[PDB]
Amino acid sequence: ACPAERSGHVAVSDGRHMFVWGGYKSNFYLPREELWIYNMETGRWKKINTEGDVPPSMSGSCAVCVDRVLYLFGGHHSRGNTNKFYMLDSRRVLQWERIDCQGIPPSSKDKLGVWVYKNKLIFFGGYGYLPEDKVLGTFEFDETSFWNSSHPRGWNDHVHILDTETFTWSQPITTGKAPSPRAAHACATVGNRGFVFGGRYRDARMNDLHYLNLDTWEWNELIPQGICPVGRSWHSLTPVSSDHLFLFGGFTTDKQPLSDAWTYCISKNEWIQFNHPYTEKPRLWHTACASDEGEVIVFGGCANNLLVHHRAAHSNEILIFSV
């Protein structure tokens, strides 16, 4: 068996098993009850039908795998954005649990990112409806959304903590200059550093690199010397060591699908372009997962401009990078 093609799905991993859920395609959200598992050592798939509080089928959800427990936040279904939070213990028939979190949740959102640090899930950014005044951060409307939709939407720079000891939402008080509001950025965690690269804001797909110190809540902008990757959204950014982040794919401001790959060297603050055999397989809105065997496993996404919906080339291919 092989999963149907898709973009905007989630893929999370424990370093050996990759769990794939959700997304959409063209003849259409994929079936909500299906969980696809890819064994990274053997390269074979297995479909599991889940039960319990199965989430609606969505694209743009934000998921993590912590100690083989999957957590899912936010996303976009046929009736718009959500801020619901789910848990699926993958450690018998797997059962989704919708969690009743305490505290003030983030605004309903998709295309965001997350950092995992000890007992905390830390969510940043995204695209969705207007929040409430009490939320710390900034929100910027997408002007185009006032004619396309019944509810206008926009970008945020919000940082929210979900504390898994109590399933309670909070917001930290940060110092430094946060990145601008953005969506379709990519987040990656190494140690106590929550890195974020690129994303869409206003009329640009950006090339900037920041990290949030997850001990001190201080924001830092990184300015690597020399050649940097072109700005983009819908890319992946994946930790592959205690000193390296792996970047692949995405979409430029001028709407060019990308097949370039790079390593960011943290200790050197330097980007290194990565040579690979997939130069003719650009991907945007794919997922990337690191394996315990020195590989990055890219799945799904679209080979061309998926904003032209009737021509979109959604994929079900596995691309394997040896980093």
Binding site: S59, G60, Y127, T144, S145, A184, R200, S233, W285, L307
Partner: peptide, 6 residues
């Protein structure tokens, strides 16, 4: 509607 904001 699901692709906006990127």
């Amino acid at each position: 509607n699901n692709t906006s904001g990127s």
